[PDB]
Design a binder for this molecule. Structure first.
Ligand SMILES: CC(C)COc1ccc2c(c1)[C@]1(COC(N)=N1)c1cc(-c3cncnc3)ccc1O2
Length: 369
């Protein structure tokens, strides 16, 4: 899998992208890697923000599905024309598949001014594909048409340029240390999981665990922050406020509405607590925990942004979580694996951790229905 190592690039806060080719002859595009959606959609018109775009008129293998698709989402929208074409991944497996491609023809707040990507690769399941679940997501097409095993894994490395690895069809042991610990994929739509317990500096938040997953918890490479349900965010901030009493901060800061600054080099990591999420384990009454540092949740913009935010769509384990870990999207076995990332950023005192097993009762009650 060495050829796939370091196949991800990006700029801080603008997502991680992978190089792809579409059409014959192949057209090279950079594509945002998104485990939080399920469409393969590429710019197909000369939007001023785009370095390049899909030109269907140059492709002999293009097939028109003669159908439109309309996709608003919480932070923008895109609209496009459905088709199929030959798609490959230069720094992925040595294969070419015929996949659905939405040719983006109108969008709002979708493309980023200054970014180096031109499209989005939705790695989640058909249930949330647009316009409906009969539009086969790319990864399903890949697995159906080749011998590529039904899993992929992500090592997101963070820092400005960011880098990482998407290992398609397997797992690269050089990207992590210790053991992988697996949590069940609750349902195949988003990559949905169940959080059974939350600690701040080893101190249990002591909330009904249903709150942690109201109305869902997902693993999402297409979200920057750790996003937490409102009630849980509130409780987490109160505890983090308390744990970091050494200094005082404005209420806007905890809402991600203004930065806070330290004279360069004297940033006090130590006054900031670690955060632990316990995830439902593979066995009845068994869990494991993942632990991140302030290096993960205080984002550099020396100034810093608080990168934990409140949510009305449930818990979202975005880049803030994923950058601590090597994450295995084991589709074949309906589970997601976490191990300590070989690239994660740590000091000489504390370190991101994946630890188990723990005894946790009533974990089935933590899921929302
Ligand atoms: C299945 C439905 C409900 C959600 O569907 C969508 C559709 C489009 C869509 C995105 C999601 C989004 C927003 O969050 C995620 N995961 N992808 C998304 C995220 C980014 C993004 C990611 N990271 C950093 N900056 C921007 C850019 C575009 C973008 O577009």
């Amino acid at each position: 899998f060495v050829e796939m190592v370091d196949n991800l690039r990006g700029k801080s806060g603008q997502g991680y992208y992978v190089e792809m080719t579409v059409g014959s002859p192949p057209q090279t595009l950079n594509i945002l890697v998104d485990t939080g959606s399920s469409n393969f959609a590429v710019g197909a018109a000369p939007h001023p923000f785009l370095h390049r775009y899909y030109q269907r008129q140059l492709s002999s293998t293009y097939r028109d599905l003669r159908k439109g698709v309309y996709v608003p989402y919480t932070q923008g929208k895109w609209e496009g024309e459905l088709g199929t074409d030959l798609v490959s991944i230069p720094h992925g497996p040595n294969v070419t598949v015929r996949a659905n491609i939405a040719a983006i023809t109108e969008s709002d707040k979708f493309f980023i001014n200054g970014s180096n990507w031109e499209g989005i690769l939705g790695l989640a399941y058909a249930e949330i594909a647009r316009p409906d679940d009969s539009l086969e997501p790319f990864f399903d097409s890949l697995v159906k048409q080749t011998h590529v095993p039904n899993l992929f894994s992500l090592q997101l490395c963070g820092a400005a340029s960011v880098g990482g690895s998407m290992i398609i069809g397997g797992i690269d042991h050089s990207l992590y240390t210790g053991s992988l610990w697996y949590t069940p994929i609750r349902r195949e739509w988003y990559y949905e999981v169940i959080i059974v317990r939350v600690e701040i500096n080893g101190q249990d938040l002591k909330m009904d665990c249903k709150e942690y997953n109201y109305d869902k918890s997902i693993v999402d490479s297409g979200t920057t922050n750790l996003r937490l349900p409102k009630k849980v965010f509130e409780a987490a901030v109160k505890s983090i406020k308390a744990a970091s009493s050494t200094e005082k901060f404005p209420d806007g800061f905890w809402l991600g509405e203004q930065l806070v600054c330290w004279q360069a080099g004297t940033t006090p990591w130590n006054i900031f607590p670690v955060i632990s999420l316990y995830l439902m384990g593979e066995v009845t009454n068994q869990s494991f925990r993942i632990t991140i540092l302030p290096q993960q949740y205080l984002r550099p913009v020396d100034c810093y942004k608080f990168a934990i935010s409140q949510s009305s769509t449930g818990t979202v384990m975005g880049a803030v979580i994923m950058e601590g870990f090597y994450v295995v999207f084991d589709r074949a076995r309906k589970r997601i694996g976490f191990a300590v990332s070989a690239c994660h950023v740590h000091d000489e005192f504390r370190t991101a951790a994946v630890e188990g097993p723990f005894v946790t009762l009533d974990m089935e009650d933590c899921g929302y229905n």
